[PDB]
Amino acid sequence: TLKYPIEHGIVTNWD
Amino acid sequence: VSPKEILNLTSELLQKCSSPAPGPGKEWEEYVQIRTLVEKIRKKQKGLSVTFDGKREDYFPDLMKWASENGASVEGFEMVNFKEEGFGLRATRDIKAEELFLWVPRKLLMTVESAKNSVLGPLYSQDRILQAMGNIALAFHLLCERASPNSFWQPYIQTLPSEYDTPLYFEEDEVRYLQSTQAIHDVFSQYKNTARQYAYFYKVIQTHPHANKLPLKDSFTYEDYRWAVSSVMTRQNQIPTEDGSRVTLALIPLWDMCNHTNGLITTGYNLEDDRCECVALQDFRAGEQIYIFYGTRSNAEFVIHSGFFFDNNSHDRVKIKLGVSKSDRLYAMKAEVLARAGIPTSSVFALHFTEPPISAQLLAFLRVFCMTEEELKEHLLGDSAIDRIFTLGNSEFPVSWDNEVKLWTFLEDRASLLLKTYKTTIEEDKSVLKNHDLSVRAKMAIKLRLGEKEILEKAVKSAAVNREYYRQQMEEKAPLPKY
Ligand SMILES: Nc1ncnc2c1ncn2[C@@H]1O[C@H](CSCC[C@H](N)C(=O)O)[C@@H](O)[C@H]1O
């Protein structure tokens, strides 16, 4: 398995 | 043109965008009020503080040379301006599925850590918002380096886009298409958050001595901030820290030029060699665009945070809010069963377009939501109660045929009611798309509102079918499956 998969443009909180 | 007038306008914008929500019934009016103030500030400013003399593609050779000198892969692909996706990577040789073809060492990345060690460091150590929100920190890291001509990251920054298709760039009438949808509330929030943050940091940069050496002290425009947050939201990534014990946010040059297609995530971080690594999602022949899979995000998320709508997104979903009512005579028991199952009494669940429409957690919630008192007691008391909780999320083991009939009836009626809260029908949306000539941004909004309703309509049909299946089992007195 990918130990540290990288999600391109992962959603973060800006509130 | 005077700094005192801008200061007055940003103070007004800060107070406007710091008020509480006016209620959903006036959120559109609030949105237009904030837009009007933002546009007045934008018209009195000079656009991006720093612009570059060359065209975007003039700088890709510098990006490659810089990435090469620091250990990244630079052979086997080229940058091409594609019509559908914008710039992306195209293969110059055949690339086999699962071949490790792209790698980017940590030294090239822009991270919260490199933001801390930069000219932004002193202000970062003082401001509580920067310390709490790594994504905003990355955005100011980008702006500060953009305005620093000798920045190590200039080759990356000069090849970034100068504009995006996030809703921050939409016209008022393009957002108006989203009235009555689920997604428009997130559009409203993004716009108000972004305007509040711009005005807040505009004032902070003026008053904090730690900001004296920043280029932003001399010029920091609304356009700068909109560009910076849109750059971060459309491209940022989570990676482990150097020691592997924590996570951080980063921009990853070169690799982040890949556009999105459906598939699986094939990019991961290699701690031992301290670099990002990407293996090929599928075979790519020479002359074919190289894609990656961004992640299992919905089209609402792709539009709002990534600036595009993806046709045939197999992970699309809509939200549905459900909770046990505190006027339910069985509230206390249902809440305890949910709590023992690890499920809150009230939550926002998802409805999916790809089968199955509901997750194990939503199935489990709906079963408890429709339980009789006798069924609740069997999930609370005795030596099989824990076993019964264990299977609550499993479609293969219902509580009872009656419980299934009730929950699928409920979901069919609720999904039907939700469809009735939209301003247009599915058929009207398809007619608009077929008979009008629209911008890319307008089409993103209309396809988004169409997609919400199509997911709800499929849920109605799937719930109706499920209601019929379990009513048959009930009428045939079929033996209940036992786990
Ligand atoms: N399948 C797709 N369809 C349309 N646009 C896409 C796409 N995948 C990625 N994009 C675009 O690419 C952006 C992510 S960064 C990828 C490189 C980008 N095209 C550039 O020119 O720098 C998104 O914000 C969106 O504008």
Secondary structure (DSSP) of B27-51: HHHHHHHHHHHHHHHHHTS-SSS--
Domains observed in chain B: 2-317 (3.90.1410.10), 318-482 (3.90.1420.10)
Give B60-68's long-range contacts (Cβ < 8 A, gap of 24+): B60/B159, B62/B155, B62/B158, B62/B159, B63/B155, B63/B156, B63/B158, B63/B159, B63/B253, B63/B254, B64/B254, B65/B155, B66/B108, B66/B155, B66/B156, B67/B104, B67/B108, B67/B155, B67/B253, B67/B254
Give B192-196's long-range contacts (Cβ < 8 A, gap of 24+): B192/B17, B192/B30, B192/B31, B192/B34, B193/A14, B193/A15, B193/B17, B194/A14, B194/B168, B194/B225, B194/B226, B194/B229, B195/B13, B195/B16, B195/B17, B195/B34, B195/B37, B195/B38, B195/B222, B196/B13, B196/B14, B196/B17, B196/B18
- Which residue of chain A comes nearest to B308, CA vs CA? A9
Nearest CA to ligand 1 atom 16: B257
Cβ of B229 within 8 Å of Cβ of A10? The answer is no
Tally helices (H) and strands (E) across chain B. 19, 12
**Count, residues in chain B:** 483
What is the spatial order of strands in the sheet that B237-240 belongs to? B110-111, B247-251, B237-240
Q: Coil, strand, or helix at residue B439? A: coil
Q: Which residues of B touch A12 (CB under 8 A)?
A: 134-135, 233, 236, 249
Whose tokens are 């150590």? That residue is B125
Which of B134, B189, B268 is opposite residue A2, by nearest beta carbon?
B268
Whose tokens are 């305007």? That residue is B195
Resolution in A: 1.9
**Count, residues in chain A:** 15
Selection from B256, B223, B228, B251 nearest residue B87 by Cα = B256
Cα(first)–Cα(last) distance of chain A, in Å?
33
Q: Name the DSSP letter for residue B189.
A: H
Experimental method, per PDB record: X-ray
**CB-based contact B366:B410 (threshold 8 Å):** yes
Nearest CA to ligand 1 atom 21: B87
Q: Which residues of B touch A6 (CB under 8 A)?
A: 237-239, 252, 265, 267-269, 276
Q: Atom of ligand 1 at shortest distance to CA of B307?
A: 24
Q: Which residues of A touch B134 (CB under 8 A)?
A: 12
Tokens of residue B259, six digits: 């556009």
Selection from B294, B249, B244 nearest residue B267 by Cα = B294
Cβ of B268 within 8 Å of Cβ of A4? The answer is yes
On the 0-12 / 13-18 / 19+ scale of CB atoms within 10 A, B193 is middle
| Interface subset of B 256-285, CB within 8 angstroms of A | 256, 258, 260, 265-269, 271, 276
